[PDB]
RNA sequence: GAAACUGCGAAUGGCUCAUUAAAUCAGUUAUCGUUUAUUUGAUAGUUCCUUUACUACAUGGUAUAACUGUGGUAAUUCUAGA
RNA sequence: AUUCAUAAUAACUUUUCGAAUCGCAUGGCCUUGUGCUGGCGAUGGUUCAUUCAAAUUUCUGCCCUAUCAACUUUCGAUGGUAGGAUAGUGGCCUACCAUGGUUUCAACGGGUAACGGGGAAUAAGGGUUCGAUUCCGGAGAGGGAGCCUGAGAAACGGCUACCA
């Protein structure tokens, strides 16, 4: 799925495409608001914490 | 039907306006105001259908938005503003003053009045109540409220009103034998004194009226507007002086003035 | 071209619209109705105000030939005509340009298309430009 | 001066005659039985506080559209995160 | 005609309103503070009045029908008390209580290829027949119900649900 990541300290944004259901799997059952550590998703994201804010499904 | 109605089908217009049958479909609908819908004369009507100053309705807005016309002292810029009986219409340019007052056929007559008389008016007091904080007020037929009237002033008396100021400057009691203008009914327009009042507790006093031709008729109280003394009116009357002639008498007048 | 004769009846000096207004009653023997340009060109040289502040219309010519009756206006200035005259009239004369536009229902259709958009639009141009990849 | 916010209007108008037989409607009443945007005319010296070490009145608070920018869906006057 | 308008006392209130707004002009005044004053009119604001309304409402007046004679209270029918609800009266609704209400002067029921009225057609008169339809009133937006906004809608070129 596609990730829509914003750094709201810099008011920046850019999207990331994650394939591999194993890396994707970290977000499952996590809600909106819940925090998510980064390394799981990518080795770039190590250190980073993500807040889940929303998104869109297919359709 | 869901809300305030906002149009007026020509034909449902009051007749004393003398609008034509065709040429259109609607008549102007009198805005809310000092005078009731059906006993009013919208500015549009006066500026175009009587005075012939405008040809269009479009030119009535044009005349008005330059603040040419002013009613009862104040300017007024509503095309269909409800002018009414006793009100005073003024054109500063053209140096012209008017009072709205009835025919003998029940219509609003074009009546030129002098610049001084053009600065006051008469009001039938319609109710006199004690208002909040103990202040007594009167209310006149054109919906003015006037605080602190004369204690002697009661309902049905007429009242002389400054205009330049809000205040009353004189009043006339509803008595046996006082000049009366009839405002409603068939005898709309007739003028004459008062012979006596029928009482009828619980609905519609009757006022027996005689004019200066020893002719007599009756109306509901409601329709009687005191305006002075036998002789002394407190405003100028239109030519005819509210006397009403038979169709014969009117025929003979009109065919007496015949030789060019 | 046969004397004619322009008569003006029922006349009202109308300050609150800056003009004199009147009936125009034209006798025209042996001349089938006179025309409006002639009537402003002439009435000008009567009411001392010059053509392009004289307005004229109404006008149907009488049954059986001879006469036409219309209506006339003469403004105190050309500044005043150009502002108190109906704009189609100024067009007839040559004092205003017929700024013609889209069909009345072409306009309506543009209004209704425009209702489908919320905001300026150009946001929607770029976003819909991305589509050209999916 | 686009967009957008705010205000007002969209309850008028136009159409039709399915329902409806004491209903509607007409003429005539009543409100000492109520609501009433608007128009018009009136109408407001009082707001704080155990009432000297005193309160923003020379005027107090953010949170949002439009917008910028990152997006989703075959698809609508769909709309999400920043 | 009133327990009316208006006022007075004791308190009450998740305290209503009592201008943190906008446009033109820039002027007076002396103790010289950018002091203190100050013009015309916009928009707003509480209460009362007025105007445009609305909602109920009194009296009388509808076509055919007895092969419709009794009808009304199931699960309000008719009245009384109190409340609740409403903008407000009222069985409008609820609780208690009573047994009332309409009818051959045709109730009740059925039919209507019935919206009502201003009116139309037919010309001795008396009548007979018609009015979906230019104006007034009412009702509806495929059918039913519900409701949001709002002064005003049970709104349909508004929403919600079910049915088609
Ligand atoms: Mg109007
Ligand atoms: Mg009464
Ligand atoms: Mg258009
Ligand atoms: Mg737009
Ligand atoms: Mg309608
Ligand atoms: Mg907040
Ligand atoms: Mg009281
Ligand atoms: Mg100064
Ligand atoms: Mg049978
Ligand atoms: Mg009861
Ligand atoms: Mg019983
Ligand atoms: Mg019978
Ligand atoms: Mg039917
Ligand atoms: Mg019928
Ligand atoms: Mg009909
Ligand atoms: Mg039918
Ligand atoms: Mg409806
Ligand atoms: Mg259909
Ligand atoms: Mg059913
Ligand atoms: Mg509906
Ligand atoms: Mg509609």
From Swiss-Prot, chain A:
Subcellular location: Cytoplasm; Nucleus, Nucleolus
Bilayer-spanning residue ranges: none
Source species, domain of life: Eukaryota
Note in the entry: Present with 66000 molecules/cell in log phase SD medium. There are 2 genes for eS6 in yeast.
Family: Belongs to the eukaryotic ribosomal protein eS6 family.
Subunit organization: Component of the small ribosomal subunit (SSU). Mature yeast ribosomes consist of a small (40S) and a large (60S) subunit. The 40S small subunit contains 1 molecule of ribosomal RNA (18S rRNA) and 33 different proteins (encoded by 57 genes). The large 60S subunit contains 3 rRNA molecules (25S, 5.8S and 5S rRNA) and 46 different proteins (encoded by 81 genes). Interacts with snoRNA U3. uS11 interacts with MPP10. Component of the ribosomal small subunit (SSU) processome composed of at least 40 protein subunits and snoRNA U3.
Function: Component of the ribosome, a large ribonucleoprotein complex responsible for the synthesis of proteins in the cell. The small ribosomal subunit (SSU) binds messenger RNAs (mRNAs) and translates the encoded message by selecting cognate aminoacyl-transfer RNA (tRNA) molecules. The large subunit (LSU) contains the ribosomal catalytic site termed the peptidyl transferase center (PTC), which catalyzes the formation of peptide bonds, thereby polymerizing the amino acids delivered by tRNAs into a polypeptide chain.
Protein name as it appears in the record: Small ribosomal subunit protein eS6A
Organism: Saccharomyces cerevisiae (strain ATCC 204508 / S288c) (Baker's yeast)
Parent-protein start and end of this portion: 1 to 59 of 236
From Swiss-Prot, chain B:
Gene Ontology MF terms: RNA binding; rRNA binding; structural constituent of ribosome
GO cellular component, one term: cytoplasm
Residue ranges of domain S4 RNA-binding in the record: 41-104
Keyword match NAD: no
Keywords: Cytoplasm, Isopeptide bond, Phosphoprotein, Ribonucleoprotein, Ribosomal protein, RNA-binding, rRNA-binding, Ubl conjugation
Family: Belongs to the eukaryotic ribosomal protein eS4 family.
Protein name in UniProt: Small ribosomal subunit protein eS4A
From Swiss-Prot, chain C:
GO BP terms, alphabetized: cytoplasmic translation; maturation of SSU-rRNA from tricistronic rRNA transcript (SSU-rRNA, 5.8S rRNA, LSU-rRNA)
Record-linked Pfam families: Ribosomal_S24e
Modified residues (Phosphoserine): 13, 55
Extent of Basic residues compositional bias: 104-114, 123-134
Compartment(s) where it occurs, according to its Swiss-Prot or TrEMBL record: Cytoplasm
Family matches, as PROSITE patterns: RIBOSOMAL_S24E (PS00529)
SUPFAM superfamilies, per the entry: Ribosomal proteins S24e, L23 and L15e
Keyword terms: Acetylation, Cytoplasm, Isopeptide bond, Phosphoprotein, Ribonucleoprotein, Ribosomal protein, Ubl conjugation
GO MF entry, a single one: structural constituent of ribosome
Note: There are 2 genes for eS24 in yeast.
HAMAP family the record matches: Ribosomal_eS24 (MF_00545)
Oligomeric form and interacting partners: Component of the small ribosomal subunit (SSU). Mature yeast ribosomes consist of a small (40S) and a large (60S) subunit. The 40S small subunit contains 1 molecule of ribosomal RNA (18S rRNA) and 33 different proteins (encoded by 57 genes). The large 60S subunit contains 3 rRNA molecules (25S, 5.8S and 5S rRNA) and 46 different proteins (encoded by 81 genes).
Protein name: Small ribosomal subunit protein eS24A
């Amino acid at each position: 799925m596609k990730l829509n990541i914003s750094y709201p300290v810099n008011g920046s944004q850019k999207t990331f495409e994650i394939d591999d259901e194993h890396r994707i799997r970290v977000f499952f059952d996590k809600r909106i608001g819940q925090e998510v550590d980064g390394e799981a998703v990518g080795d770039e994201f190590k250190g980073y914490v993500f807040k889940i804010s929303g998104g869109n499904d297919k359709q | 039907a869901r809300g305030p109605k906002k149009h007026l089908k020509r034909l449902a217009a009051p007749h004393h306006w003398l609008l034509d049958k065709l040429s259109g479909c609607y008549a102007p609908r009198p805005s809310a105001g000092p005078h009731k819908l059906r006993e009013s004369l919208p500015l549009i009507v006066f500026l175009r259908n009587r005075l012939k100053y405008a040809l269009n309705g479009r030119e009535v807005k044009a005349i008005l938005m330059q603040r040419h016309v002013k009613v009862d002292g104040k300017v007024r810029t509503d095309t269909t503003y409800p002018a009414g009986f006793m009100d005073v219409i003024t054109l500063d340019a053209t140096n012209e003053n008017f009072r709205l007052v009835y025919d003998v056929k029940g219509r609003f007559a074009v009546h030129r009045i002098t610049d001084e008389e053009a600065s006051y008016k008469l009001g039938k007091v319609k109710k006199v109540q004690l208002g909040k904080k103990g202040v007594p007020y009167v209310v006149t037929h054109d919906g003015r409220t006037i605080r602190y009237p004369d204690p002697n002033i009661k309902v049905n008396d007429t009242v002389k009103i400054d205009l330049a100021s809000g205040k009353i400057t004189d009043f006339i009691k509803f008595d046996a034998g006082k000049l009366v203008y009839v405002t409603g009914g068939r005898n709309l327009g007739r003028i004459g004194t008062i012979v006596h009042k029928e009482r009828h507790d619980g609905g519609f006093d009757l006022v027996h009226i005689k004019d200066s031709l020893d002719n007599t008729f009756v109306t509901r109280l409601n329709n009687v507007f005191v305006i002075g003394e036998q002789g002394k009116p407190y405003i100028s009357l239109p030519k005819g002086k509210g006397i009403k002639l038979s169709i014969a008498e009117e025929r003979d007048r009109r065919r007496a003035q015949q030789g060019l | 071209s046969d004397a004619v004769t322009i008569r003006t009846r029922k006349v009202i000096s109308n300050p609150l619209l800056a003009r004199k207004q009147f009936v125009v009653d034209v006798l025209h023997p042996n001349r089938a109705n006179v025309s409006k340009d002639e009537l402003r060109e002439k009435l000008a040289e009567v009411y001392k105000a010059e053509k392009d502040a004289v307005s004229v219309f109404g006008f149907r010519t009488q049954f059986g030939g001879g006469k036409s009756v219309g209506f006339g206006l003469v403004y105190n200035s050309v500044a005043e005509a150009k502002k108190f005259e109906p704009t189609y009239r100024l067009v007839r004369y040559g004092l205003a340009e017929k700024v013609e536009k889209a069909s009345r229902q072409q306009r309506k259709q543009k209004k209704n298309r425009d209702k489908k958009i919320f905001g300026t639009g150009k946001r929607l141009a770029k976003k819909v430009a991305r589509r050209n990849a999916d």
